[PDB]
Design a protein around this ligand. Structure first.
Ligand code: 3PE
Ligand code: HEC
Ligand code: HEM
Ligand code: HEM
Ligand code: HEM
Ligand code: UQ6
Ligand code: UQ6
Lengths: 373, 238, 164, 34, 48, 98, 76, 66, 184, 38, 54
């Protein structure tokens, strides 16, 4: 059977490495999260109305009178947060174990990451709260950076002089349509990978030890799905407002602006970098590079060993990178004042210097220690 | 720079602690008799109460208590009907400007989601309503202002609305300023999340189901993976 | 051979024209629609703002800030000299009448509402990133790139200022 | 040997850029640029 | 017990049948039990 | 420097899982070539070593200490061959520029 | 696919049926020692960056507070 | 009608830690008042005292209230 | 290249019969029409509001105030008509030339036909005209015919006692989401 | 053929340039025809 | 079209409603900008955002 040929081969008998840890669960979790988001998003779309006239209320109605509608809305919000948690851990697995040498898979990945960030940004604009409106204006105006092409482009997205209904409705359309493009790009992501097979934490050729996927990494993915569902629900049913922001529960006032404005947690590392660079344009570029530096990552691998299991100096540099990523996430939250700014400036300098300079030099030193260089 | 309201041991705070639902009853009475003159609980309709702290027929009573005129009329441009169960709570100062006019140009924010919209709302609310202390030296609030250490800027247009024994609780529980601020904070909380109780029941069922299902799925995984985890490899070059 | 190649070059040319027209339509569609465009309408009453007050009008969506200035703001604003002024603009060239200061109302630092009379220089302040604008709306401290834009206000009279 | 290879494409490469550029100005309907 | 395996698990369909029946009843018990537990947990703070 | 080396060795850990330096070289085009040229024995041996490592990782376990590789014992089986692959590779490259 | 993945020789591989082996043999018996064995081998590479993140975070907070602290000489 | 809060604030102020704080603030108050040309206010001083008092009240107010 | 291999395998080096007439064009036309519909539908979705107070107003705003919005709307409507013309001729080609012996292809086809008819029905309900509302009630009523569970099903879909805003919004969501399932 | 039909690169240039002018020309002629009809 | 707009303006406007047609749509079709501006200034509308005026 043509389909079953595709199925069994791809989902049941896919020779997989026998020794991949729980981190390799995370990408499958991302796919599940995508489906969960789509399903919850569809059940938000049967009652939401893009009109700036009824948006806030539409959402209120969603969390007040729509049957179990509060459940689906907070599942959607905390599932976006769970999506970004699993995305960050997936990218960290790819950075740590040398999986970026699968270059086409890595590039389709960073395209997926850009698409997911754009989808989450427009989705956060969608409830039309105080925080959504000022957040949209703010980094939309970020686009106003480009000197000749930027200004017009901004109002083009804004569809007018300033974000207003024109934006909300087109942001609803784009936020609806992009997760299906994300699903298609994820299918391309899976294809570009099966051509090469998954990597293992030792970083070695695992062709001598491969097992089926149906009984070994399926029940493992089911267990990971169950644990991820435990964390999501316990972040919806018990702590539903933990990851959100209180000022989004006020209606969008163009005349007032929330005093303390901040992007959601996931977009902060970038926020910090942007704020750090004095020049507006510089910030925008660095911000982009922040995400793009990853794509650049497969050309910076100067070691003869694929994984970091046997590479302790680059392990130390990797955990310092995770450390100042957490620092940049914290700084974004902090307001503009001493000494948060300096940390932000250093943390950004250290982030770019560790990824660009320190890891290939450390890999050269590690190759010299094993009498290889 | 703002005073950060402390943590009060709110009853509903407990993981499985539902809203009193007895207190709320009192709190609303507080909103209906005091807070409804300036603030608008736009997203809470009389029907909403049924099932929380007022029974169907009982709610009908309250609904009728107020009057609601709808413009659509055969020839008239309105018809006044005592509020029905479906009617939403009556907002005063129809236009915000009305409110500004009389509130020193300060719009009483809808207290529908105030607790959710204010950082540490339940506490803030309690603190603000009870934080009407003496202004310090050097402070010069503008005309029509009052001093509350919590409110952003410490200059809230709202005058202190809860004077001890401001209103009498029908239940008879002494109407001390605090007993009133705690009740209205519980109610506003309920308002901002009418499903608080239902959810926590779902969370309890979720914890019981995950405590049943996680070791069993772990046992199935460790069954299927035992085979390999016991595999013994031996190299036997000829 | 040339003829056949000529045929397609021609065909391709026509297609380019075809593709060009269509895309423009879609982009323009997404681009400002007539209604959006038909919003430049604007009128305000001067008497509305007492000296030293920031008034909002949200003209063209951007919360319009039609502000008035106090004696200090009206007079000291010029004392900024030029080097002292972060930007190269002139305080009064920003206002036909010093007391009435009219500005868009969006700090240039990625956009936000300026907080009038709050800040380090006072006169305006961008809570988002700490940009302090003077009463003239000129960025004096912080990371905001340029002074608050001043709209094409028409001082029709001393009691009613109608940008348009 | 590589130099010769580069030389051969330098002009053609410019031609290609020019081709796109001509259409670019047209597509962009930029009056400012060409 | 061998009986269980011999009667309920041996036949795949029975394996499902038992699961099906179990599911039909589990809800009742779990719901009621959790409900009461919850009720007891919040014994006094409720609508009643 | 031996102290450093031996120390780094234990730190890397590839020894713990019964794997010599060479066993842990990423399979780039060149490395792959050298691998093929390997006399069959080393190849078969290499394979068991690698397969064994994989099994251990599976259980998140390491070999008994005694079985651990020794900085001194460690032999570089592929090094002699790999150099050739690189040498040949470079020669072809320069000739290309000719 | 399977069959054409790799070439091994003389590597015998013994195994047991799932139902013939206990589910979590010596689970806590050796699991604890192993988990502890593991934590030792990785704690010095992992922990000190997060330790200095904690110090920088606290420092920033306290420093910020002091920064907000009023200069005694202020307005006097 | 004694508002439990009233009583609690009494006990809480009676807490020595809190007592010391109030003193500091009063010094500020008079200092501020005594100082002629100044703008420094005891708000920050007031703020600090409150945090403590409130925390203490937090520990004993809810229960007192019914 | 593993992405270009499938594209080559399905569009470039695919061995096709040399003598297939113009009727074999029609299925490819259907795919083009699908895209066209999706593209036009996306540019209707940036201005359409699925509220019963504002749906007709949003459609008139598209036709009157959006630049070339009348063009995209009437392209969407007449492209739905062109989709059904090409669909009927595709099915007629399959019936005439005995192409139904490709049984799996034929069954996936009739599933696609059902999905396209449901998508077009809910899309015609979407502008909330006089004809859309009475048409919706009519076919939704069709379901009530079900012997035992009919009433419930109808009410479910309607989302209430009778088609009203509840329907319009869920019909907007379903009409948005089904052409991607049609593409898959 | 010897200028725009010999090598793909040459062909591309003429296409871009010609399309550039044909656009305006087409509209211009259409103006006449459209006005002619109306 | 200009003559037919006059008809509505005078005879049929008092009872029928041309809601989806605004004074803006006429510019460049039947009237100039100033003529349509005068036509629009001929019919008062309600805004009601006054401090109290509603
Ligand atoms: C948290 C610390 C988790 C941890 O235990 O780290 C050490 C662990 C050791 O693993 P290894 O050295 O491979 O030895 C395996 C032996 N069975 O090494 C690992 O656990 C590797 C884990 C890989 C994924 C780590 C992801 C951390 C978060 C990264 C987020 C940012 C990613 C980049 C974003 C841009
Ligand atoms: C008779 C008048 C009046 C009564 C009674 C009143 N309020 Fe208000 N309230 C106002 C006005 C006026 C404002 C606007 C003040 C401002 O925005 O600065 C206001 C604003 C508020 C705010 C906004 C604070 C913020 O964070 O911006 C809260 C919270 C609030 N009131 C709570 C209450 C609660 C809780 C009660 C009773 C349990 C209450 N009010 C009773 C007049 C009143
Ligand atoms: C096609 C599938 C999807 C649909 C139909 C959909 C639909 C919606 C709708 C209607 C809203 C508005 C509800 C509200 O915010 O109050 C919304 C909000 C949101 N969506 Fe989606 N969505 C989808 C996929 C996604 C995905 C994949 C993400 C994550 C990247 C995402 C993240 C969000 C976020 C963060 C919000 C705002 C939550 C909040 O209110 O704070 N959605 N979505
Ligand atoms: C939400 C979007 C994404 C999804 C759904 C996704 C999904 C997957 C899936 C299912 C796999 C199969 C192997 C596994 O899951 O462990 C995988 C592998 C991989 N992904 Fe992603 N991915 C996404 C984004 C990314 C991004 C942004 C990157 C780059 C940082 C990336 C890099 C990789 C790499 C390198 C692999 C191969 C790892 C291996 O199998 O050894 N992916 N992805
Ligand atoms: C995902 C792709 C699609 C989107 C986003 C979409 C979106 C919309 C929207 C917003 C409307 C209401 C406004 C209007 O077009 O008049 C609409 C109407 C309509 N759509 Fe779709 N649509 C899509 C695909 C389709 C397809 C594939 C068909 C054909 C089967 C179809 C047939 C219709 C019809 C007949 C109408 C009513 C047209 C009218 O108002 O006269 N659409 N569509
Ligand atoms: C063995 O190698 C594989 C593999 O063969 C496959 C197919 C997957 C894919 C597994 C998933 C269930 C993820 C789902 C991926 C998508 C295509 C997301 C798209 C979502 C939809 C809406 C459908 C793997 O994750 C994997 O490594 C573990
Ligand atoms: C046997 O010859 C073929 C053939 O092999 C293929 C693939 C197609 C398919 C090519 C098309 C242009 C039709 C559209 C194809 C799609 C895959 C549609 C994709 C569009 C989506 C919205 C999904 C044909 O139309 C065709 O006969 C002419």
């Amino acid at each position: 059977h043509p389909l079953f040929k595709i199925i069994n081969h791809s989902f049941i008998d896919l020779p997989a490495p026998s020794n991949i840890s729980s981190w390799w669960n995370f990408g499958s979790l991302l796919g599940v999260c995508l489906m969960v988001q789509i399903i919850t998003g569809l059940f938000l779309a049967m009652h939401y109305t893009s009109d700036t006239m009824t948006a806030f209320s539409s959402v209120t109605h969603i969390c007040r009178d729509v049957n179990y509608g509060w459940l689906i809305r907070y599942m959607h919000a905390n599932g976006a947060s769970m999506f970004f948690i699993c995305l960050f851990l997936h990218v960290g697995r790819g950075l740590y174990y040398g999986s970026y040498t699968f270059m086409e898979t890595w590039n389709i990945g960073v395209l997926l990451l850009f698409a997911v960030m754009a989808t989450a940004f427009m989705g956060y604009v969608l409830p039309w709260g105080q925080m959504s409106f000022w957040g949209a204006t703010v980094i939309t105006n970020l686009l106003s950076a480009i000197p000749y092409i930027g200004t017009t482009l901004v109002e083009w997205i804004w569809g007018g002089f300033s974000v207003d209904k024109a934006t909300l409705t087109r942001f609803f359309a784009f936020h609806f349509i992009l997760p299906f493009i994300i699903a298609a790009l994820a299918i391309v992501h899976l294809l570009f990978l099966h051509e090469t097979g998954s990597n293992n934490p030792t970083g070695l050729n695992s062709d001598a030890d491969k097992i089926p996927f149906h009984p070994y990494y399926t029940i493992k993915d089911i267990l990971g799905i169950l644990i991820m569902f435990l964390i999501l629900m316990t972040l919806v049913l018990f702590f539903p407002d933990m990851l959100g922001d209180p000022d989004n529960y006020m209606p969008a006032n163009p005349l007032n602006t929330p005093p303390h404005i901040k992007p959601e947690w996931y977009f902060l590392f970038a926020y910090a970098i942007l704020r750090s660079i004095p020049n507006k344009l510089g910030g925008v570029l660095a911000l982009i590079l922040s995400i793009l530096i990853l794509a650049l990552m497969p050309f910076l691998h100067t070691s003869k060993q694929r994984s970091l299991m046997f590479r302790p100096i680059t392990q130390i540099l990797y955990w310092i990178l995770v450390a100042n990523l957490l620092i940049l996430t914290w700084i974004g939250g902090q307001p503009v004042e001493h000494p948060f700014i300096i940390i932000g400036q250093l943390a950004s300098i250290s982030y770019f210097s560790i990824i660009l300079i320190l890891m290939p030099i450390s890999g050269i030193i590690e190759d010299k220690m094993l009498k290889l260089y | 720079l703002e005073l950060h309201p402390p943590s009060y041991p709110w009853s509903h705070r407990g993981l499985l602690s539902s809203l009193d639902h007895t207190s709320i009853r009192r709190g609303f009475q507080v909103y209906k008799q005091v807070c409804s003159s300036c603030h608008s609980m736009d997203y809470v309709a009389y029907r909403h109460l049924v099932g929380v702290c007022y029974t169907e027929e009982e709610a009908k009573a309250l609904a009728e208590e107020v009057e609601v005129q709808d413009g659509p009329n055969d020839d008239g441009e309105m018809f006044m009907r005592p509020g029905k169960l479906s009617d939403y709570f009556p907002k005063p100062y129809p236009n915000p400007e009305a409110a500004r006019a009389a509130n020193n140009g300060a719009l009483p924010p809808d207290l529908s989601y105030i607790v959710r919209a204010r950082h540490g709302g339940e506490d803030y609310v309690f603190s603000l309503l009870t934080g009407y202390c003496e202004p310090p030296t050097g402070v010069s609030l503008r005309e029509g202002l009052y001093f509350n250490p919590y409110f952003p800027g410490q200059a809230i247009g709202m005058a202190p609305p809860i004077y001890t024994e401001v209103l009498e609780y029908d239940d008879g529980t002494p109407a001390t300023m605090s007993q009133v601020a705690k009740d209205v904070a519980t109610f506003l909380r309920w308002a901002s999340e009418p499903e608080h109780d239902h959810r926590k029941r779902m969370g309890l069922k979720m914890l019981l189901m995950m405590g049943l299902l996680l070791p069993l799925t772990y046992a199935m995984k460790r069954h299927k993976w035992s085979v390999l985890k016991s595999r013994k490899l031996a190299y036997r070059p000829p | 051979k040339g003829f056949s190649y000529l045929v397609t070059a021609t065909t391709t040319v026509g297609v380019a024209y075809a593709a060009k027209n269509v895309v423009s339509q879609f982009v323009s569609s997404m681009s400002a629609s007539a209604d959006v465009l038909a919003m430049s309408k604007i009128e305000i009453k001067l008497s509305d703002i007492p000296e030293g007050k920031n008034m909002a009008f949200k003209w063209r969506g951007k919360p319009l800030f039609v502000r008035h200035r106090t004696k200090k703001e009206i007079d000291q604003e010029a004392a900024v000299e030029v080097s002292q002024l972060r930007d190269p603009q002139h305080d009064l060239d920003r206002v036909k009448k010093p007391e009435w200061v009219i500005l868009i109302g969006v700090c240039t630092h990625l956009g936000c509402v300026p907080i009038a009379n709050a800040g380090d220089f006072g006169g305006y302040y961008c809570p988002c990133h700490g940009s302090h604008y003077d009463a003239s709306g000129r960025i004096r401290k912080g990371p905001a790139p340029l002074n608050l834009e001043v709209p094409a206000y028409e001082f029709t009279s001393d009691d009613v200022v109608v940008v348009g | 040997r590589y130099r010769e290879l580069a030389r051969n494409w330098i002009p053609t490469a410019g031609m290609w850029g020019t081709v796109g550029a001509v259409g670019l100005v047209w597509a962009t309907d930029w009056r400012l640029i060409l | 017990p061998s009986r269980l395996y011999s009667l309920l698990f041996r036949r795949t369909s029975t394996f499902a049948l038992t699961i099906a029946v179990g599911a039909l009843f589990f809800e009742r018990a779990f719901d009621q039990g959790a409900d009461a537990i919850y009720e007891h947990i919040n014994e006094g703070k409720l609508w009643k | 420097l031996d102290g450093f080396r031996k120390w780094y060795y234990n730190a890397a850990g590839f020894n713990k899982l019964g794997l010599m330096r060479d066993d842990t070289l990423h399979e780039t085009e060149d490395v792959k070539e050298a691998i093929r040229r390997l006399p069959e024995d080393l190849y078969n041996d290499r394979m068991f070593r690698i397969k064994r490592a994989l099994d251990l990782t599976m259980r998140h376990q390491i070999l008994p200490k005694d079985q651990w590789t020794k900085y001194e014992e460690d032999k570089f089986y592929l090094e002699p061959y790999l150099k050739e692959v690189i040498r040949e590779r470079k020669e072809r490259e320069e000739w290309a520029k000719k | 696919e399977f069959g054409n993945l790799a070439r091994i020789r003389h590597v015998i591989s013994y195994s047991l049926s799932p139902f013939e082996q206990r589910a979590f043999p010596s689970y806590f018996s050796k699991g604890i020692p192993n988990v502890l064995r593991r934590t030792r081998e990785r704690i010095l590479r992992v922990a000190p960056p997060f330790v200095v993140v904690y110090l920088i975070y606290t420092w920033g907070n306290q420093e910020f507070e002091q920064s907000k602290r009023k200069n005694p000489a202020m307005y006097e | 009608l004694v508002d439990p809060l009233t009583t609690v604030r009494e006990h809480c102020e009676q807490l020595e830690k809190c007592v010391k704080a109030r003193e500091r603030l009063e010094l500020c108050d008079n200092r501020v008042s005594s100082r002629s040309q100044t703008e420094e206010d005891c708000t920050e001083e007031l703020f600090d005292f409150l945090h403590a008092r409130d925390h203490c009240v937090a520990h004993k107010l809810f229960k007192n209230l019914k």
